[PDB]
Scaffold this active site. Sequence first.
Site, short mmCIF file in Angstrom:
data_model
loop_
_atom_site.label_atom_id
_atom_site.label_comp_id
_atom_site.label_asym_id
_atom_site.label_seq_id
_atom_site.Cartn_x
_atom_site.Cartn_y
_atom_site.Cartn_z
N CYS A 227 32.56 -28.59 21.46
CA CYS A 227 33.50 -29.01 20.43
C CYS A 227 34.39 -27.86 20.00
O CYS A 227 33.96 -26.73 19.97
CB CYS A 227 32.76 -29.55 19.21
SG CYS A 227 33.86 -29.95 17.83
N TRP B 201 40.13 -30.72 20.54
CA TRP B 201 41.24 -31.35 19.80
C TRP B 201 42.66 -31.05 20.30
O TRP B 201 43.63 -31.42 19.64
CB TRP B 201 41.13 -30.99 18.32
CG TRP B 201 39.74 -31.11 17.79
CD1 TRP B 201 38.78 -32.02 18.17
CD2 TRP B 201 39.14 -30.31 16.78
NE1 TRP B 201 37.63 -31.82 17.47
CE2 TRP B 201 37.82 -30.77 16.60
CE3 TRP B 201 39.60 -29.23 16.01
CZ2 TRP B 201 36.95 -30.20 15.68
CZ3 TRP B 201 38.73 -28.66 15.10
CH2 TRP B 201 37.41 -29.15 14.94
N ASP C 33 34.38 -32.80 22.54
CA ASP C 33 35.13 -33.22 21.35
C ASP C 33 36.11 -32.09 21.08
O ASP C 33 35.94 -31.30 20.14
CB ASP C 33 34.16 -33.43 20.17
CG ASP C 33 34.86 -33.91 18.89
OD1 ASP C 33 36.07 -34.20 18.92
OD2 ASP C 33 34.20 -34.00 17.83
N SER D 228 36.19 -34.41 12.77
CA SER D 228 34.88 -34.70 13.30
C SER D 228 33.89 -34.77 12.15
O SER D 228 33.59 -33.76 11.52
CB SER D 228 34.47 -33.64 14.32
OG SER D 228 35.36 -33.65 15.42
C1 LIG Z 1 39.99 -36.26 17.31
C2 LIG Z 1 40.34 -35.02 16.54
C3 LIG Z 1 39.41 -34.46 15.65
C4 LIG Z 1 39.73 -33.31 14.95
N1 LIG Z 1 38.79 -32.78 14.08
C5 LIG Z 1 39.09 -31.64 13.36
C6 LIG Z 1 38.16 -31.09 12.46
O1 LIG Z 1 37.06 -31.60 12.29
N2 LIG Z 1 38.48 -29.95 11.77
C7 LIG Z 1 39.70 -29.34 11.93
O2 LIG Z 1 39.95 -28.31 11.30
N3 LIG Z 1 40.63 -29.87 12.82
C8 LIG Z 1 40.34 -31.02 13.53
N4 LIG Z 1 41.28 -31.55 14.39
C9 LIG Z 1 42.86 -31.36 13.87
C10 LIG Z 1 43.23 -32.18 12.63
O3 LIG Z 1 43.29 -33.56 12.92
C11 LIG Z 1 44.57 -31.76 12.05
O4 LIG Z 1 45.52 -31.72 13.09
C12 LIG Z 1 44.54 -30.42 11.30
O5 LIG Z 1 43.65 -30.50 10.20
C13 LIG Z 1 45.91 -30.02 10.79
O6 LIG Z 1 46.45 -31.11 10.08
P1 LIG Z 1 47.54 -30.87 8.93
O7 LIG Z 1 48.06 -32.20 8.45
O8 LIG Z 1 46.97 -30.01 7.83
O9 LIG Z 1 48.67 -30.00 9.68
P2 LIG Z 1 50.01 -30.62 10.28
O10 LIG Z 1 50.97 -30.97 9.16
O11 LIG Z 1 49.84 -31.76 11.26
O12 LIG Z 1 50.52 -29.36 11.10
C14 LIG Z 1 49.74 -28.98 12.22
C15 LIG Z 1 50.70 -28.34 13.20
O13 LIG Z 1 51.12 -27.12 12.64
C16 LIG Z 1 51.44 -26.21 13.66
N5 LIG Z 1 50.80 -24.92 13.34
C17 LIG Z 1 49.53 -24.71 12.86
N6 LIG Z 1 49.32 -23.38 12.70
C18 LIG Z 1 50.46 -22.74 13.08
C19 LIG Z 1 50.80 -21.40 13.13
N7 LIG Z 1 50.02 -20.52 12.51
N8 LIG Z 1 52.06 -21.03 13.57
C20 LIG Z 1 52.99 -21.99 13.95
N9 LIG Z 1 52.62 -23.32 13.92
C21 LIG Z 1 51.39 -23.69 13.48
C22 LIG Z 1 50.92 -26.80 14.96
O14 LIG Z 1 52.02 -27.24 15.73
C23 LIG Z 1 50.11 -28.01 14.55
O15 LIG Z 1 50.29 -29.09 15.43
C24 LIG Z 1 40.97 -32.70 15.11
C25 LIG Z 1 41.89 -33.26 16.00
C26 LIG Z 1 41.58 -34.41 16.72
C27 LIG Z 1 42.58 -34.99 17.68
#
Ligand SMILES: Cc1cc2nc3c(=O)[nH]c(=O)nc-3n(C[C@H](O)[C@H](O)[C@H](O)COP(=O)(O)OP(=O)(O)OC[C@H]3O[C@@H](n4cnc5c(N)ncnc54)[C@H](O)[C@@H]3O)c2cc1C
Length: 603
Positions: A555, A602, A600, A391
């Site tokens: 949000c 997620w 908003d 966001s």
């Molecule tokens: C429209 C939209 C807007 C978003 N905006 C934001 C934002 O502004 N700020 C923000 O921080 N996030 C936001 N989110 C989430 C963001 O897009 C990412 O998913 C997030 O930053 C994690 O991405 P990553 O690639 O680092 O982790 P990834 O490699 O995708 O891994 C994330 C996954 O790890 C797993 N996981 C996480 N923590 C644990 C845990 N402790 N134990 C076991 N499993 C775990 C979960 O299954 C999760 O799905 C938003 C999501 C959407 C759909």
Amino acid sequence: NRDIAQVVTENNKNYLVLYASQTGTAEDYAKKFSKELVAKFNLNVMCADVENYDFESLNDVPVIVSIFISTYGEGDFPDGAVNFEDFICNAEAGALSNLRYNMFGLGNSTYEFFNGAAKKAEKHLSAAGAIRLGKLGEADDGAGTTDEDYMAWKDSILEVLKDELGVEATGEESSIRQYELVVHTDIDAAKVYMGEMGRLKSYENQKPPFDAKNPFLAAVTTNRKLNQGTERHLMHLELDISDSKIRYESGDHVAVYPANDSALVNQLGKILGADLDVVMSLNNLDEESNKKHPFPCPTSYRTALTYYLDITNPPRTNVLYELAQYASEPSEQELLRKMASSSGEGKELYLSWVVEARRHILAILQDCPSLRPPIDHLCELLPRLQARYYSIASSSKVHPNSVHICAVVVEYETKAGRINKGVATNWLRAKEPARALVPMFVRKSQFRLPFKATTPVIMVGPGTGVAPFIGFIQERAWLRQQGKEVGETLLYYGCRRSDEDYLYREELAQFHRDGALTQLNVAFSRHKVYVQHLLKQDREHLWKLIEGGAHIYVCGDARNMARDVQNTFYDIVAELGAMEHAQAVDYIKKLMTKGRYSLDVWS
Ligand SMILES: Cc1cc2nc3c(=O)[nH]c(=O)nc-3n(C[C@H](O)[C@H](O)[C@H](O)COP(=O)(O)OP(=O)(O)OC[C@H]3O[C@@H](n4cnc5c(N)ncnc54)[C@H](O)[C@@H]3O)c2cc1C
Ligand SMILES: Cc1cc2nc3c(=O)[nH]c(=O)nc-3n(C[C@H](O)[C@H](O)[C@H](O)COP(=O)(O)O)c2cc1C
């Protein structure tokens, strides 16, 4: 004891093989078949000499019956199997209508009545209502064909049974390769994809319009820790979109195509045995299909793993299924097929070992050391690396050529003692402003400040969900700086602690000082003071604002918080509006339709 249906049921048999045999040939082959039945379907088989049972309950046998039977006189059965014969010939119409059987007779054409026993038997079985599955077999000892006659028959009935019993034969990989390998060991770098997403060389060329298919490479201008504590890393990034022509507003999301950690990609290449710099293409075996490749090709394995492939999330059922053949250790191969299964037991081993342990492909390879697939089959099976959304935490009115991101780094220990790293956030964190480029694009949402400045706004954004509201507040401040009258601007923020994870403590205090933020309501949980109670606390004031045409915004990461916040607003409208709960929900519904209650969230 001699009751064949009784004994079959008692002992929990899945399948009955019967034989009638004077000189042991039918016995031998009845036994050979049984052994093959078990080896391939893991059934619980009885294999019995007809001579040892009474067959008055043949019709009550609830499993499939194979019958092996020899001929010995005028198409007679062996003299020992008299009782079995007397039952088959006396069998009246309908007597065996539940019997499902297959048959393999043993004879010798050099006698008068070739296979008379099995021929007689079959006339009587069907006459009495039994259904034969597959062909009637007829071994010819006179031709010396008996073994091959059996071999052919057996192969046949096993195909018939595969459909009758469901299931597949242990020793089988109905494995379909969707794509084919071609190694481009000579080709110029200009023709080779390097991690770009659409047209070749688009990360170089960079021509508008930038979007999902053609992301802009934005330099990282700022990247600072937002939080006081050390348990977690929360960060504020700024993305320079100067000269992109990308337009955004507060409430929009910015999408980002990350890279996988190179150390992870290396470790993966080293355990696969594969050299990752091999440039190649995976061309579709379906020649006429749209998807010619699983990801941009020609490209190297290093590049596919880095930019185009998801290698960090738990692999799915079908990728375990397809990898299971490459596990040389049989018990490791049994695991994977079981976890790939539709079994309650298998599904459950999968959920805890694969999904709940968050075992990525590397982890599965490391813990199953005998699982050694070819890189090219793996790359075909792994899912595509998706963009990640954030966001935007800036207003385009103060930051037209800069897009801000607020994010918590995902970094956690698994049940299995591993440390997992979230792809995009650790990648973004490693981006040092001293160029570091992030492929990105903007998707418009309907999450907007009111265009009529005087309209009050109520923002509920615990934790990282403050993100969009940082830009809302910059924007509202900006409107006041421009001579516009701005309505009340209330933030309901939340965190664990003021000296641990208070996001934007300086900026929010200062926006409050300058009157840009009319109220900063923080609910620090660490006794369980969540934002719901701050909303209920301020209910009297919130109802005036709402009644005065205010816009509400929710949000955050958690669906439940959004649900609790909505429930809290339901009660406020119920009490202060003096209406039934059902009318309250319908009022908030009306707000949503008018675009005055926006989310908003997620998950
Ligand atoms: C429209 C939209 C807007 C978003 N905006 C934001 C934002 O502004 N700020 C923000 O921080 N996030 C936001 N989110 C989430 C963001 O897009 C990412 O998913 C997030 O930053 C994690 O991405 P990553 O690639 O680092 O982790 P990834 O490699 O995708 O891994 C994330 C996954 O790890 C797993 N996981 C996480 N923590 C644990 C845990 N402790 N134990 C076991 N499993 C775990 C979960 O299954 C999760 O799905 C938003 C999501 C959407 C759909
Ligand atoms: C005395 C005797 C009679 C036989 N009569 C027939 C017969 O009438 N028709 C036939 O096809 N085969 C006949 N055969 C061949 C047997 O059925 C054949 O050898 C078969 O494999 C025997 O299987 P078993 O060892 O289970 O008894 C006869 C064999 C013997 C030894």
